[PDB]
Design an enzyme around this catalytic site. Structure first.
Site, PDB file in Angstrom:
ATOM      1  CG  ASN A  46      -2.123   0.997   1.072  1.00 13.76           C
ATOM      2  OD1 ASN A  46      -2.536   1.505   2.107  1.00 13.76           O
ATOM      3  ND2 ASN A  46      -2.581   1.367  -0.125  1.00 13.76           N
ATOM      4  CE1 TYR A  78      -5.540   9.570   1.743  1.00 19.14           C
ATOM      5  CE2 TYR A  78      -3.508  10.815   1.768  1.00 19.14           C
ATOM      6  CZ  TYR A  78      -4.281   9.788   2.272  1.00 19.14           C
ATOM      7  OH  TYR A  78      -3.792   9.032   3.310  1.00 19.14           O
ATOM      8  CD  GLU A  87      -6.876   7.686   4.689  1.00 20.66           C
ATOM      9  OE1 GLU A  87      -7.580   6.746   5.104  1.00 20.66           O
ATOM     10  OE2 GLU A  87      -5.727   7.528   4.179  1.00 20.66           O
ATOM     11  CE1 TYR A  89      -9.310   7.557   1.696  1.00 24.27           C
ATOM     12  CE2 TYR A  89      -7.920   7.623  -0.258  1.00 24.27           C
ATOM     13  CZ  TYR A  89      -8.152   7.184   1.028  1.00 24.27           C
ATOM     14  OH  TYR A  89      -7.201   6.371   1.559  1.00 24.27           O
ATOM     15  CD  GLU A 177      -4.849   4.568  -1.244  1.00 24.97           C
ATOM     16  OE1 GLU A 177      -5.091   3.607  -0.463  1.00 24.97           O
ATOM     17  OE2 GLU A 177      -5.363   5.703  -1.110  1.00 24.97           O
TER      18      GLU A 177
HETATM   19  O1  LIG Z   1       6.024   8.935   8.822  1.00 24.60           O
HETATM   20  C1  LIG Z   1       4.739   9.321   9.350  1.00 24.60           C
HETATM   21  C2  LIG Z   1       3.678   8.526   8.610  1.00 24.60           C
HETATM   22  O2  LIG Z   1       3.598   7.199   9.172  1.00 24.60           O
HETATM   23  C3  LIG Z   1       2.267   9.140   8.597  1.00 24.60           C
HETATM   24  O3  LIG Z   1       1.873   9.031   7.246  1.00 24.60           O
HETATM   25  C4  LIG Z   1       0.495   8.793   7.071  1.00 24.60           C
HETATM   26  C5  LIG Z   1       0.196   7.333   7.402  1.00 24.60           C
HETATM   27  O4  LIG Z   1      -1.071   6.917   6.888  1.00 24.60           O
HETATM   28  C6  LIG Z   1      -1.255   7.113   5.478  1.00 24.60           C
HETATM   29  O5  LIG Z   1      -2.610   6.722   5.141  1.00 24.60           O
HETATM   30  C7  LIG Z   1      -2.819   5.336   4.825  1.00 24.60           C
HETATM   31  C8  LIG Z   1      -2.817   5.262   3.323  1.00 24.60           C
HETATM   32  O6  LIG Z   1      -3.463   4.064   2.925  1.00 24.60           O
HETATM   33  C9  LIG Z   1      -4.861   4.071   3.219  1.00 24.60           C
HETATM   34  O7  LIG Z   1      -5.514   3.003   2.510  1.00 24.60           O
HETATM   35  C10 LIG Z   1      -5.029   3.867   4.711  1.00 24.60           C
HETATM   36  O8  LIG Z   1      -6.424   4.016   5.079  1.00 24.60           O
HETATM   37  C11 LIG Z   1      -4.135   4.856   5.477  1.00 24.60           C
HETATM   38  O9  LIG Z   1      -3.800   4.197   6.679  1.00 24.60           O
HETATM   39  C12 LIG Z   1      -0.990   8.578   5.047  1.00 24.60           C
HETATM   40  O10 LIG Z   1      -0.922   8.673   3.598  1.00 24.60           O
HETATM   41  C13 LIG Z   1       0.327   9.137   5.603  1.00 24.60           C
HETATM   42  O11 LIG Z   1       0.511  10.561   5.393  1.00 24.60           O
HETATM   43  O12 LIG Z   1       2.066  10.525   8.918  1.00 24.60           O
HETATM   44  C14 LIG Z   1       3.050  11.101   9.769  1.00 24.60           C
HETATM   45  C15 LIG Z   1       4.428  10.806   9.178  1.00 24.60           C
HETATM   46  O13 LIG Z   1       5.427  11.643   9.781  1.00 24.60           O
END
Ligand SMILES: O[C@@H]1[C@@H](O)[C@H](O[C@@H]2CO[C@@H](O[C@@H]3CO[C@@H](O)[C@H](O)[C@H]3O)[C@H](O)[C@H]2O)OC[C@H]1O
Ligand SMILES: [Cl-]
Ligand SMILES: [Cl-]
Ligand SMILES: [Cl-]
Ligand SMILES: [Cl-]
Ligand SMILES: [Cl-]
Ligand code: NA
Length: 194
Positions: A46, A78, A87, A89, A177
């Site tokens: 992912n 996003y 979150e 979209y 994504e």
């Molecule tokens: O390094 C740190 C990161 O771990 C953090 O990044 C966010 C983590 O979650 C991400 O979202 C996921 C993307 O995939 C989707 O399907 C899921 O629902 C989500 O869990 C997001 O893109 C990142 O920005 O943020 C803080 C950083 O410093």
């Protein structure tokens, strides 16, 4: 040009960007001039990557370019809110898998009709670490790559359907994504506050 292969946020040629991967397969993002970025991915787990803004808001987002998933990928405006943690979209393109959830109705925006859905993730990665949060979705009824996203139309429809956003304290990007997929994207973003 700067190639990104490792989790990070920052600024490039006057645009905010975010790169995130669970580390599966091979994923890169290239940051080019102004609002341009490209991505290449092979058998990813992912990832979410893109350029936009340090803070979300009501913005007329213009973008163009290409988006070529083989399997499950999204092209989405996003971002995240605080208090509550959400979150969100606005999905213009996808692959074999159309995002779904609890159906809340439609909104008409930028030449298209969008289905609205809410889902929930428990103890998942987020901008506040491991957290439970709702996901708000606008999904275009027909796939496209490029045009305008009037984020106000989506935020207002979400609010009419009892989906309240928190504070725009985190990023808002035009995101590529992927999930257990391969593909590429080559996109340009711009925008201004409605
Ligand atoms: O390094 C740190 C990161 O771990 C953090 O990044 C966010 C983590 O979650 C991400 O979202 C996921 C993307 O995939 C989707 O399907 C899921 O629902 C989500 O869990 C997001 O893109 C990142 O920005 O943020 C803080 C950083 O410093
Ligand atoms: Cl449509
Ligand atoms: Cl759910
Ligand atoms: Cl818990
Ligand atoms: Cl396309
Ligand atoms: Cl448009
Ligand atoms: Na709600």
């Amino acid at each position: 040009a700067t190639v990104i292969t490792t989790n990070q946020t920052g600024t490039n040629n006057g645009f905010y960007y975010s790169f995130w991967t669970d580390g599966g397969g091979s994923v890169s993002m290239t940051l080019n001039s102004g609002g341009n970025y490209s991505t290449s991915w092979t058998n990813c787990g992912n990832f979410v990557a893109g350029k936009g803004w340090s803070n979300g808001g009501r913005r007329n987002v213009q973008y163009s370019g290409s988006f070529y998933p083989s399997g499950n990928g999204y092209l989405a405006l996003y971002g995240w809110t605080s208090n509550p943690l959400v979150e969100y979209y606005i999905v213009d393109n996808w692959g074999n898998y159309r995002p779904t959830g609890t159906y809340k109705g439609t909104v008409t925006s930028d030449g298209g009709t969008y289905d609205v859905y809410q889902t929930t993730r428990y103890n998942a990665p987020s901008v506040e670490g491991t957290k439970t949060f709702n996901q708000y979705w606008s999904v275009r009824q027909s796939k496209r790559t490029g045009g305008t996203i009037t984020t106000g139309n989506h935020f207002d429809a979400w609010a009419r359907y009892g989906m309240q956003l928190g504070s725009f304290s985190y990023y808002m990007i035009l995101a590529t994504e992927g999930y257990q997929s391969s593909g590429s994207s080559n996109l340009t973003v711009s925008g201004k506050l409605a």
